[model samples]
Target: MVPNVVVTGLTLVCSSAPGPLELDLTGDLESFKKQSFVLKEGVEYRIKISFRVNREIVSGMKYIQHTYRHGVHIDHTDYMVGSYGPRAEEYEFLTPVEEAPKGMLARGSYSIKSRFTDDDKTDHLSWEWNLTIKKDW
Candidate 1:
């Protein structure tokens, strides 16, 4: 059987937010562009990606992200999400803790393009979102 993986959602986990900021994977791209998640500078945060696999096992699952600020590329991340067997329950993967950039120069809006794929190069999910860094959330 061909491996099948479905990415369900993504969540931003941080100390500043009252709860996890959930991003629905099934939403339209335009809606994502219109929303900006606010984060305070110098805060520690992580991203949790939820997914499920079916039919067969998936290997070498990966998460990729590109961040741009003021129309210029500022950062890129590629995370090896590992392999998984078919399961009835969704699986969640949490990224390593990351610190939001601080300083006057870093306080602004950033555009993000994120992707989920596997070693077979099959694209699971791709979306765009925005983030704004502020002095306070």
Candidate 2:
């Protein structure tokens, strides 16, 4: 089965770049059922989002470097068809994700979330995702 929602058309902008910034965080999700609905184990679904800036590009990788210093976080919630206040909870995974090799997935997200951060200065610059994560039909 497919995911409850489909994510696409995501863009990543870096403060430090010699030229234009681009990112292709495309992925596929099948059977993404979590514990909220029915407690399950060893059954997990994952998606990836990644982008790399040339060492000579961007503010000399300083922004990216800061991303590495910061910890990775993922806040997730599961909503059953129709529910009330007792909605699902938020889960935070404080792990560090690194830049993976070509044709490889490091980490990904849906909506406005940062699973991995090399370094990001609030005022100086930041990033956002144009994706979606909705309930199943």
Candidate with top lDDT is 1
> How would you encode candidate 2's per-residue C-alpha lDDT over 30-87 as one tens digit per residue?
1121111110122222223223322222221122211221234334422111111211
- Please give, for residues 5-116, the per-residue lDDT of candidate 1 as tens digits: 8788888899678656889886776798999888889999999999999878888999999999988998999999999999889999999999889999899999999999
TM-score of candidate 1 to 2 decimals: 0.93
For model 1, the stretches where C-alpha displacement exceeds 4 angstroms are: 1-3
lDDT of each: 0.89, 0.25
- Between which residue pairs do clashes occur in model 1? none
Error of model 2, residue 110, in angstroms: 8.3
**Using Cα atoms with residue i matched to residue i, what is each candidate's TM-score against the true structure?**
0.93, 0.21
